[PDB]
Structure formats: C-alpha cells, structure tokens
C-alpha cells in the first residue's frame, strides 16, 4: 500500500504544515501538524476545555461508530517551546491521503495550552519520530507509520515541504519525480527517539565549506534551524546590522537585507537553503526588524533541522530495520 496527502503553509512565514487526515467513521477531517520530532497522534476534541477551542476542527469519538474507548490510558505531552496538552484515547481508523491504519491510537485532548489554543489552523498534531517517545500510560502507543509500515510497499514516508508554497508526505514510496540528482542517505541514532544524524558541514552563502560534524533532528514539527552558537554566529555576520537580541530572544535583522544562503551537509552532498527561506518577517507587526529563520541551539540542549532546512531538501525517512535519513535536492 501507499499513501499521499498534500501539506500546506498555516500562514505567510511558513510557521507551520498542516496535512488533512481522516479520523473515524464516517470520516471526520482534521488538519494536523505533521511532527518527526514527536510519536503521539493527537486531536482537538468534543472532550476539550471549552474555553481552550478557538476555530480548531474537532474530533468526536461519539460519532464514531468505529471508536473505542481504549480504558485506562491517558497521555500528557510538554513540547520544546513549553506548550503541552493531555487527555484520554481512543482506537478508530485514520487514513492518510489514501493509506488507512484501523485501530489507530487517537489522543483526545482535555487540556492544550496556550499556543495550541492561539493557533486557529492547527487541530492537532501526528508524531512521526519513534514509537519509543509515545506519551499514553500505562500502555504505550504506536505511531501511525509504525502501524502502517508493515503494509506499505516500502517501509518509508518522504517529507517534501514548500517554501510559500504546498508540498507532499508521501508514505510507502519515493517519488524520483520530487527531486533532483541523486538521494544521498545518512546513518540515524533513534537512542534519544528522534530521527538524530550527524551533518558533516556548512557555509555561508559562496564561502568556504566548513567540515565539522552536528549532530541534531530532523523535525518537520519545528519551524526553524537551530545550530551551534558559532555556526550561528558566522552566518549572521555575513548580514550587515544583524544582531542577537536578548529581549526579542534571538537574532534580528533589518528587513531590507537580502539574507545569504545557508549550506549543510549530508555526506559528501550539499543542501543549500536560498537567503529567503531564512527572513521569518518583521518582530512585531509594522516594524522594519526582521527575526531570523537560523538560531542558536544554546537554549535547546539538541541541533534541530526544522523545516527551514528541511524544506530545502526532499527528504526520505527511511524505517527500515536500521532506520537511516535520505537526502536530495530539489
Ligand atoms: C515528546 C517528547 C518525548 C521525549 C523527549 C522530548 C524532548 C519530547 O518532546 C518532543 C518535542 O518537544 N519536539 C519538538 C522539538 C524538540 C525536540 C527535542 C527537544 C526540544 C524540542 C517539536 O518537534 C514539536 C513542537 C510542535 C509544536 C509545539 C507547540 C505549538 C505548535 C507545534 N515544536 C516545538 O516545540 C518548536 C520549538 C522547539 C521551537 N516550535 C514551537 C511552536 C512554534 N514552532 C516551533 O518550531
């Protein structure tokens, strides 16, 4: 079997993807943030705190007529940026541009945080890392790729995100169509749950290569790069008046630069982020300060390839036995 679904810009900047999945019988369609670096499927729901739902799509398990109540299991989630959300879980088939898995763990959602509720576009979110980090107790839950991934002709889904523009996951097969020249593949380290690789290097705009290894995530459910403070720092001194702000909480720019690309490598191959993909527009509505789409990771504790690079690149994540990490232009 094989799946295909198109995913699509929240906004303008790109903040985030969201991809239509079908919940339930008859189906009930959600939008979902699409997230490698999480492994819980869970939605806006009839159970969720009313003040806390604000335009999001719902999921109604009592209109289900394949839904289960899975009796016993809750889930709590805290994200990287502090949002978090948690609730109960059902069973019900979900499909994926035509790919469905039956007795999938579907996360119903009492509680979201703020963020979730500010976010009008967003009803919830697929995991997409390893099982491994599934939140539900006291039984663990699978991914939906783990769910489908003995039936798909090829035990893979592929992340092909549009810069201001829609994009594909594809699950089950690689689309030679999507990309240019050849897909160079990476070893993966699923010791934390992520899908964690090491890149062998960068550069800034037309400078030198630079060859050291960064180890960080690919994570389609992160909107920026977070790098190394030093690599951060070369890059932002290529854009004249740039500067790390500690009251906006990064690095600013003024929006009448033109931003030069960002290279990172896989292997002996290059990626090569255009300066566009990394102007996330003005602070603050109606200022002539721009935030930057590359950050440091100093903060975080972990190097994240979110979707500024991501977007970059068609990407295969391979889940095979040994997992591994394709990359290729396009
Ligand atoms: C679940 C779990 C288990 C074990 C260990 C960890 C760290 C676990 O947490 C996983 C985790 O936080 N993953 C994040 C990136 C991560 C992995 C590991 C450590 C730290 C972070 C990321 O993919 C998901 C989450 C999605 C999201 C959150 C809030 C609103 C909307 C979307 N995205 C975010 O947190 C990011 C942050 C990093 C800037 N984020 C917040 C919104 C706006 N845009 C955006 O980019």
Redesign the pocket.
Known sequence: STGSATTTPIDSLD??YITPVQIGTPAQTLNL?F??????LWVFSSETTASEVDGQTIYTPSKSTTAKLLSGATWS?????G?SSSGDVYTDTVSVGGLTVTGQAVESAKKVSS??TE?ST?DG?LGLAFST?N?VSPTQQKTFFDNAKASLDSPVFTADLGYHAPGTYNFGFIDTTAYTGSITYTAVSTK???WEWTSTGYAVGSGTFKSTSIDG?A?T????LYLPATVVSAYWAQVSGAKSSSSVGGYVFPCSATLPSFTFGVGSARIVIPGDYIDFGPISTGSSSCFGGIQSSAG???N?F?DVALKAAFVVFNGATTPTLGFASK
């Open positions: 903040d985030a943030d997230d490698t670096g999480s492994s819980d989630i805290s994200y990287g940026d949002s963020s979730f976010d967003i979110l980090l939140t934390q749950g992520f995530i994570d459910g992160t909107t920026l975080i504790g972990i994240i979110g």
